[PDB]
Amino acid sequence: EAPAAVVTGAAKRIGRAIAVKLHQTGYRVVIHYHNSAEAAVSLADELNKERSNTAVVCQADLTNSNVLPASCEEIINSCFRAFGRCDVLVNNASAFYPTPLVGKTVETQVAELIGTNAIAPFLLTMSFAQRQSNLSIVNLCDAMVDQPCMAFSLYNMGKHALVGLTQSAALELAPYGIRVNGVAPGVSLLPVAMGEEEKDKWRRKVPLGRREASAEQIADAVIFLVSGSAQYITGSIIKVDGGLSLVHA
Amino acid sequence: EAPAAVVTGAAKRIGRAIAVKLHQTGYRVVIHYHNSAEAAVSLADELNKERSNTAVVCQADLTNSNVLPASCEEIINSCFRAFGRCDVLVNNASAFYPTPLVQNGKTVETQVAELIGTNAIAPFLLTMSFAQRQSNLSIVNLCDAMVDQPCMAFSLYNMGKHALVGLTQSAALELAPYGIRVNGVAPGVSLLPVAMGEEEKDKWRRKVPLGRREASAEQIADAVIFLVSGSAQYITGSIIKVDGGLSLVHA
Amino acid sequence: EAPAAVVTGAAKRIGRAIAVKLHQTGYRVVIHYHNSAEAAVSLADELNKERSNTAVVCQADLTNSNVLPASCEEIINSCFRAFGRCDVLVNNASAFYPTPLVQGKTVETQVAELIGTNAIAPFLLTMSFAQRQSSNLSIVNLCDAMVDQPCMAFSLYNMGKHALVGLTQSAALELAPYGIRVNGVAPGVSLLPVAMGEEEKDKWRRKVPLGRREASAEQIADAVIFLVSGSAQYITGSIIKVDGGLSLVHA
Amino acid sequence: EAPAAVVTGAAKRIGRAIAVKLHQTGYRVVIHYHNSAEAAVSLADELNKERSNTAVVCQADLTNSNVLPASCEEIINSCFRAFGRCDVLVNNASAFYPTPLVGKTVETQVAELIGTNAIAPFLLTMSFAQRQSNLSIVNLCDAMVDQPCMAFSLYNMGKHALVGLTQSAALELAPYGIRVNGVAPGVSLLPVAMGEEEKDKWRRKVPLGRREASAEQIADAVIFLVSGSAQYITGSIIKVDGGLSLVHA
Ligand SMILES: NC(=O)c1ccc[n+]([C@@H]2O[C@H](COP(=O)([O-])OP(=O)(O)OC[C@H]3O[C@@H](n4cnc5c(N)ncnc54)[C@H](OP(=O)(O)O)[C@@H]3O)[C@@H](O)[C@H]2O)c1
Ligand SMILES: NC(=O)c1ccc[n+]([C@@H]2O[C@H](COP(=O)([O-])OP(=O)(O)OC[C@H]3O[C@@H](n4cnc5c(N)ncnc54)[C@H](OP(=O)(O)O)[C@@H]3O)[C@@H](O)[C@H]2O)c1
Ligand SMILES: NC(=O)c1ccc[n+]([C@@H]2O[C@H](COP(=O)([O-])OP(=O)(O)OC[C@H]3O[C@@H](n4cnc5c(N)ncnc54)[C@H](OP(=O)(O)O)[C@@H]3O)[C@@H](O)[C@H]2O)c1
Ligand SMILES: NC(=O)c1ccc[n+]([C@@H]2O[C@H](COP(=O)([O-])OP(=O)(O)OC[C@H]3O[C@@H](n4cnc5c(N)ncnc54)[C@H](OP(=O)(O)O)[C@@H]3O)[C@@H](O)[C@H]2O)c1
Ligand SMILES: Nc1nc(NC2CCCCC2)c2c(-c3ccccc3)c(-c3ccccc3)[nH]c2n1
Ligand SMILES: Nc1nc(NC2CCCCC2)c2c(-c3ccccc3)c(-c3ccccc3)[nH]c2n1
Ligand SMILES: Nc1nc(NC2CCCCC2)c2c(-c3ccccc3)c(-c3ccccc3)[nH]c2n1
Ligand SMILES: Nc1nc(NC2CCCCC2)c2c(-c3ccccc3)c(-c3ccccc3)[nH]c2n1
């Protein structure tokens, strides 16, 4: 019988490439999404057209709140409801915007940035583990985590927390046979609306090819980590950054 | 006059030693506390008996909530209110307890709010309030030397301390053009609870390469004192381990 | 036409597992060895029975000396001689033994072997690899997951492996414009000597979170195979731990 | 009795500042030098002017070779012979120049860069320990070790090995009460031997003050680490970089 995976933030971009590859490898998938309702439903349709009832959608805000634990438990439950099992979790959804130290309130920025990047991953991990052979979790981290963007303290705090979770949960879930790893993009899939000039400014920095990663290149590292070729790999974060994190100021 | 420091969770243990040492160095201090009211007031008295009008207490819960930013703003306000200035922030207060992934009384939302609020979000908000109000200005965050070899079942605590490393770096970078340095001190195992079982105390002490003992609270304070001093004026975004080699020891 | 790979120290154990997996993936292989002549020739024998004229052995000492650069150049030259090309270099050969700081081999010999095999030879093979150049060119270095929790009295071994991390990063950066990717694989504990004590092996096995066992040679090789493959086209300067969580475990 | 310190490469620049500051703190010093004979002697003269019989010189090449262990043993010996004890070792001497992967022979470059930055520190550490209060060793590391300068492979390899030594020796010498730590400068003391497009270029990247560190600021960290205020600190590397290592490309 086919394994099943939850991908958070799977409607668009990297999340979508990850769900597509997982599906192409034989997985059934829960396409989680927040606002991108048309993209998610149409993705699930494209995949079900390929193989009947191998995709379902699941909408949820992953901002930190009193209701997040229940929401995360329901995302995991949706995988069991659809597919009767949950073998892989990909924590991909992420809020990303600056939060300078000097019209959202700060407590909302905290809830979105720390919720999506760290707290929701933790809660989903808890539910994933509680509801349980090649089980694993892949967390989407950030290659530049130690050379942070200016004014992005909460985002960066969130991504650091996520490293912490990857390690802590690898240690704690190893006895249940659940591996926990990360993939750390550098710059990938620059926004379509971003001017090519500014796109080129990031591209120029990348040693390998002076270009951004494709979403599929990030997905490839995920597929490796969930494969049986990574059976002894846990607590590892693989950078897929074309050398960007190695470049000094 | 004399510079002023805020020390969070300053009523007892390591925070208290840092307050004591900053006060001996010539600082006026805000002793923040949450539950340890007696110990706090008793410390303020002792420090004011030593030099009058040089310590105050400030009570606040540093659990995450929608009012945490106001509470952090009021802490930095209480320093200006009492001393006219705020030169040093020490982010020391911290909740620490297990939060297993596979199953007190506490709800997980409470665990999240306490562990992530005290270790990460309040430091961030206090750092904002500190910078917004603004010499040798700096912030010191109490990190954890064991943050990449975490205690079993301490996920949220570890996520917190990892976040605090990220804040230390992000705020060092962002606040440098305001001449505010941001650094960390990372203890290994330090000041074991007097009430902890002797067998367990020994098990911790035996692990430490340098002297087979825990750090004193004073030893931790010494590194804080260095980082706020004029001998550390080019130092920002650095985290100094004060761990006797503990983090170096393999399984 | 099949790509070609050089594997250092490939007569046995992890190096052999890597050579075999590359060969099955379609590569022609140079099996480098130092003392294990019989094991190397035998491996090349097998692989040639599988596909003729797809393996050769190459003998070299990788101890540091004034001729080491020529020896490394001759290793790379030996791939071009046998196969007309050299696509992949795996730096796997390694001396490993204690070198205590306080007290047959002279310390000069210790430095030469430990720093030579683990770091300088990899640097010189990388130079010759780049100099002697469709393509998916890369280098994989066999690193060590426990590099920051070192074994007692293994200073020179640990310095070597740390230098290898530096090389991995430095070469990733510098050879990126040439299309040459440079990455690492960092085993924890893998392949215990058949005649290590039943107690000593079990002591190592029990430390490992994931399965309480050492990695197989195949498992290390799997990670090498990924990094050389087109599934890793954007990955350079990455070191993948393959350690079953061992590096995360505090003492 | 006054404690004694060996400082390698102490005739000029950061090494000289460390010797001065240690001497100012009450140490007797051995001033090691390789080529800067006039400056070394001038410094010893100046410190002995302050306090008689508190400074001596020792000459040695720290390039790797068959004679380097004996050379390192004699450096430590010069401290015992002059002063009757050796409480502090500062490994500061360092060769630094580009060694492109694609003049000196390569093997000479290896000997120099790996010898000064790693192997001499290791041998000096063995000699120091073998001859044994507040004993410690401070290794001058590099804050930019993970974002290395282009074409500086051997130098970066040497500095990485030095981190390794720092950690390994911290662990192994802890039972003898010998602490082992590091100080990692970012940019410090730009030569007048440097264009000012180039100097300005480096200065402009430093978040804290848009300037290099003074040699004295580097020395301040060494002083702290050797002091009684760092009694529990071992295996720690303190960056003194004005935040340079945190600045992304
Ligand atoms: N792109 C890069 O260069 C880069 C660099 C470093 C790290 N990464 C990491 O890689 C992952 C993929 O990157 P990306 O650029 O593809 O991500 P992205 O497009 O910024 O975000 C992915 C998705 O996250 C979901 N999301 C955002 N806020 C949410 C909320 N409050 N609740 C629930 N879901 C929410 C969104 O869903 P809806 O659209 O459905 O609302 C969004 O489509 C992220 O974890 C990112 O941080 C990416
Ligand atoms: N001790 C160690 O071995 C060790 C090891 C690694 C890291 N560290 C770090 O070093 C710092 C000091 O350690 P420690 O053992 O002295 O700390 P601790 O005794 O565990 O905590 C210090 C204080 O934090 C305050 N605090 C806790 N929860 C709070 C809340 N919700 N709101 C406001 N304040 C709260 C408490 O104040 P009241 O008592 O006033 O309620 C407590 O006295 C901590 O950041 C810790 O994480 C310590
Ligand atoms: N096994 C583990 O648990 C583990 C852990 C961490 C890292 N690693 C790394 O993984 C790699 C493979 O491990 P392993 O256990 O398979 O290694 P190994 O058995 O210790 O060594 C592999 C080969 O290195 C070659 N070698 C040794 N000294 C040499 C010299 N002076 N010149 C040339 N070649 C020399 C030897 O070749 P001959 O037999 O031909 O003389 C030896 O067979 C190493 O780089 C190791 O450091 C392994
Ligand atoms: N300056 C910076 O921005 C910076 C940045 C990162 C790290 N650091 C580190 O901090 C330390 C001090 O930096 P610096 O700029 O003061 O260093 P430096 O001037 O480049 O070198 C210090 C001394 O090293 C000695 N030396 C070089 N090659 C030697 C050899 N083969 N044998 C013996 N001694 C040799 C020289 O002594 P003679 O003059 O007597 O020949 C030289 O004066 C070094 O370890 C350096 O790598 C500095
Ligand atoms: N969730 C999330 N989304 C991101 N970008 C998305 C792009 C689609 C619109 C929502 C924001 C990034 C970017 C990004 C990605 C591209 C360019 C610059 C930064 C980065 C990113 C890139 C370089 C250095 C540090 C962070 N992280 C990220 N995380
Ligand atoms: N806020 C906080 N408090 C701590 N301890 C306090 C002790 C008094 C009651 C509140 C909890 C620790 C400890 C601790 C400190 C001593 C022993 C073991 C772990 C550690 C700690 C020690 C070794 C390895 C990892 C963490 N962190 C910590 N953070
Ligand atoms: N080149 C090389 N060879 C190794 N092992 C070989 C075994 C065959 C005879 C030469 C030495 C190791 C080991 C080893 C591997 C297994 C057990 C303990 C350490 C380790 C190793 C294992 C755990 C923690 C730190 C180092 N590295 C290594 N590097
Ligand atoms: N032994 C030594 N010497 C150095 N500089 C000295 C300068 C006097 C002539 C001998 C070489 C550096 C420099 C240096 C120092 C200043 C500017 C740029 C790099 C650096 C350095 C600076 C930035 C990033 C990485 C390294 N390391 C170093 N190590």
Automatic annotation (TrEMBL), chains A, D:
<feature type="binding site">
    <location>
        <position position="92"/>
    </location>
    <ligand>
        <name>NADPH</name>
    </ligand>
</feature>
<feature type="binding site">
    <location>
        <position position="13"/>
    </location>
    <ligand>
        <name>NADPH</name>
    </ligand>
</feature>
<feature type="binding site">
    <location>
        <position position="92"/>
    </location>
    <ligand>
        <name>NADP(+)</name>
    </ligand>
</feature>
<dbReference type="Pfam" id="PF13561">
    <property type="entry name" value="adh_short_C2"/>
</dbReference>
<feature type="binding site">
    <location>
        <position position="13"/>
    </location>
    <ligand>
        <name>NADP(+)</name>
    </ligand>
</feature>
<feature type="binding site">
    <location>
        <position position="188"/>
    </location>
    <ligand>
        <name>NADP(+)</name>
    </ligand>
</feature>
<feature type="binding site">
    <location>
        <position position="159"/>
    </location>
    <ligand>
        <name>NADPH</name>
    </ligand>
</feature>
<feature type="binding site">
    <location>
        <position position="61"/>
    </location>
    <ligand>
        <name>NADP(+)</name>
    </ligand>
</feature>
<feature type="binding site">
    <location>
        <position position="14"/>
    </location>
    <ligand>
        <name>NADPH</name>
    </ligand>
</feature>
<keyword id="KW-0547">Nucleotide-binding</keyword>
<feature type="binding site">
    <location>
        <position position="36"/>
    </location>
    <ligand>
        <name>NADP(+)</name>
    </ligand>
</feature>
<dbReference type="InterPro" id="IPR002347">
    <property type="entry name" value="SDR_fam"/>
</dbReference>
<feature type="binding site">
    <location>
        <position position="61"/>
    </location>
    <ligand>
        <name>NADPH</name>
    </ligand>
</feature>
<dbReference type="InterPro" id="IPR020904">
    <property type="entry name" value="Sc_DH/Rdtase_CS"/>
</dbReference>
<dbReference type="GO" id="GO:0047040">
    <property type="term" value="F:pteridine reductase activity"/>
</dbReference>
<feature type="binding site">
    <location>
        <position position="62"/>
    </location>
    <ligand>
        <name>NADPH</name>
    </ligand>
</feature>
<feature type="binding site">
    <location>
        <position position="94"/>
    </location>
    <ligand>
        <name>NADPH</name>
    </ligand>
</feature>
<dbReference type="InterPro" id="IPR014058">
    <property type="entry name" value="Pteridine_reductase"/>
</dbReference>
<feature type="binding site">
    <location>
        <position position="188"/>
    </location>
    <ligand>
        <name>NADPH</name>
    </ligand>
</feature>
<feature type="binding site">
    <location>
        <position position="159"/>
    </location>
    <ligand>
        <name>NADP(+)</name>
    </ligand>
</feature>
<feature type="binding site">
    <location>
        <position position="155"/>
    </location>
    <ligand>
        <name>NADPH</name>
    </ligand>
</feature>
<feature type="binding site">
    <location>
        <position position="36"/>
    </location>
    <ligand>
        <name>NADPH</name>
    </ligand>
</feature>
<feature type="binding site">
    <location>
        <position position="63"/>
    </location>
    <ligand>
        <name>NADP(+)</name>
    </ligand>
</feature>
<feature type="binding site">
    <location>
        <position position="62"/>
    </location>
    <ligand>
        <name>NADP(+)</name>
    </ligand>
</feature>
<feature type="binding site">
    <location>
        <position position="12"/>
    </location>
    <ligand>
        <name>NADP(+)</name>
    </ligand>
</feature>
<feature type="active site" description="Proton acceptor">
    <location>
        <position position="155"/>
    </location>
</feature>
<feature type="binding site">
    <location>
        <position position="35"/>
    </location>
    <ligand>
        <name>NADP(+)</name>
    </ligand>
</feature>
<feature type="binding site">
    <location>
        <position position="155"/>
    </location>
    <ligand>
        <name>NADP(+)</name>
    </ligand>
</feature>
<feature type="binding site">
    <location>
        <position position="34"/>
    </location>
    <ligand>
        <name>NADPH</name>
    </ligand>
</feature>
<dbReference type="GO" id="GO:0000166">
    <property type="term" value="F:nucleotide binding"/>
</dbReference>
<feature type="modified residue" description="Cysteine sulfenic acid (-SOH)">
    <location>
        <position position="72"/>
    </location>
</feature>
<feature type="binding site">
    <location>
        <position position="63"/>
    </location>
    <ligand>
        <name>NADPH</name>
    </ligand>
</feature>
<feature type="modified residue" description="Cysteine sulfenic acid (-SOH)">
    <location>
        <position position="149"/>
    </location>
</feature>
<feature type="binding site">
    <location>
        <position position="35"/>
    </location>
    <ligand>
        <name>NADPH</name>
    </ligand>
</feature>
<feature type="binding site">
    <location>
        <position position="189"/>
    </location>
    <ligand>
        <name>NADPH</name>
    </ligand>
</feature>
<feature type="binding site">
    <location>
        <position position="14"/>
    </location>
    <ligand>
        <name>NADP(+)</name>
    </ligand>
</feature>
<feature type="modified residue" description="Cysteine sulfenic acid (-SOH)">
    <location>
        <position position="58"/>
    </location>
</feature>
<feature type="active site" description="Proton donor/acceptor">
    <location>
        <position position="155"/>
    </location>
</feature>
<feature type="binding site">
    <location>
        <position position="189"/>
    </location>
    <ligand>
        <name>NADP(+)</name>
    </ligand>
</feature>
<feature type="binding site">
    <location>
        <position position="136"/>
    </location>
    <ligand>
        <name>substrate</name>
    </ligand>
</feature>
<feature type="binding site">
    <location>
        <position position="34"/>
    </location>
    <ligand>
        <name>NADP(+)</name>
    </ligand>
</feature>
<feature type="active site" description="Proton donor/acceptor">
    <location>
        <position position="142"/>
    </location>
</feature>
